[PDB]
């Protein structure tokens, strides 16, 4: 970083980071997403920078190789086993790389192709590749209802054709349908939406542990012992957790 | 080996002394009485 | 000392975050009017 190169580049522990300060910015409008990091100066408590995060190409290839190893494994012909291995790999990838992962186009393409390869393995196990033969309910139904219980990092449509069910009551057959006269389709949920981003948990961990320090000092002042009751809104909170 | 992490972190600490130099390593690590936090110094004097 | 990682106090994303916050909290780190430059070198100890 110099007089005429305003970006600071590094890579660390999976994350490719570009630090840009909020002084040498030609962009008057800030496209700040969850991946972008507001770096706060403590002596002013002022957001002076923005660390853009991405996942390195070596780690995208690491995830791809993990899926290839899953697909070459010994138990990779049983559909529940292959689905569980895919679920473990996808959970590990997203819960590690979070907002940096959602901002990497190559990583999302790799996730789509690897999920397609897992489903293709399931289909080849049945000697078919017909897309109408395997609706999203075959893969993404939870294991409780007999489905595979796969989690998706892709964006998959659920058509209105797979939204009907009939029931035989004492007066005859009634065909019920969810979504009466609605031209849109529900999509399979994205796993990345169900994980809180890293910067959010850093800020909340700071807030929660300072409140815990205050609570501990005031509780030892009145000589009472800390319990579960006064720590309820900060239960699954903090790094490390309360 | 089970203790290889410990032995290599100590050996790499010695190599960190080689890379930094003992005086700058002492300034970064802080005094033994009051060790510094990660990526922080006592004052803007010693940092610069 | 504090520079020796993996430390038990943080996950590696928190290590990257503290690297970013420690870069941002250095004295006049972004001031480059007087010819100052910031160098960051990331390397590996070969065959260590």
């Amino acid at each position: 970083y110099s007089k005429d190169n305003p970006n600071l580049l590094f890579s660390m522990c999976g994350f490719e980071v570009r630090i840009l300060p909020k002084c040498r910015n030609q962009n008057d409008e800030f496209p700040v997403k969850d991946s972008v990091w507001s770096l706060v100066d403590n002596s002013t408590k002022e957001r002076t920078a923005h660390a853009f995060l991405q996942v390195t190409e070596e780690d995208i290839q690491k995830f791809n190789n993990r899926i290839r190893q899953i697909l070459m494994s010994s138990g990779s012909t049983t559909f529940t086993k292959i689905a569980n291995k895919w679920n473990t790999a996808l959970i590990a990838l997203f819960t590690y790389y979070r907002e940096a992962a959602v901002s990497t186009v190559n990583l999302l393409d790799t996730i789509v192709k690897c999920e397609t390869k897992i489903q293709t393995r399931v289909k080849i196990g049945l000697n078919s590749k017909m897309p109408s033969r395997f609706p999203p309910a075959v893969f993404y139904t939870p294991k409780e209802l007999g489905g595979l219980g796969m989690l998706s990092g892709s964006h998959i449509l659920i058509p209105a054709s797979d939204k009907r069910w009939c029931k035989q009551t004492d007066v005859g057959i009634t065909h019920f349908r969810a979504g009466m006269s609605h031209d849109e389709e529900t999509l399979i949920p994205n796993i990345a939406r169900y994980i809180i981003p890293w910067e959010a948990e850093f800020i909340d961990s700071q807030r929660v542990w300072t409140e815990y320090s205050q609570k501990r000092l005031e509780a030892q002042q009145q000589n009472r012992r800390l319990t579960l009751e006064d720590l309820e809104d900060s239960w699954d909170r903090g790094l490390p957790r309360i | 080996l089970q203790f290889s992490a410990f032995v290599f972190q100590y050996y790499g600490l010695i190599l960190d002394l080689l890379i930094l130099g003992p005086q700058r390593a002492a300034e970064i690590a802080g005094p033994p009485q009051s060790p510094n936090d990660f990526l922080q110094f006592q004052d803007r004097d010693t940092e610069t | 000392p504090n520079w020796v990682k993996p430390s038990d106090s943080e996950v590696p994303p928190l290590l990257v975050y503290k690297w970013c916050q420690g870069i941002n909290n250095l004295d006049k780190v972004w001031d480059t009017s007087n010819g100052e430059c910031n160098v960051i070198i990331e390397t590996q100890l070969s065959k260590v």
Binding site: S205, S213 | D37 | -
Partner: peptide, 25 residues
């Protein structure tokens, strides 16, 4: 047990110092 209380307390300041990295300084 007093010793057990001491070393569980030691876990407690270990977790607080893990959470208070940089904020303590």
């Amino acid at each position: 047990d007093d010793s057990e209380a001491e070393e569980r307390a030691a876990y407690e300041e270990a977790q607080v110092r893990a959470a208070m990295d940089g904020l303590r300084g």
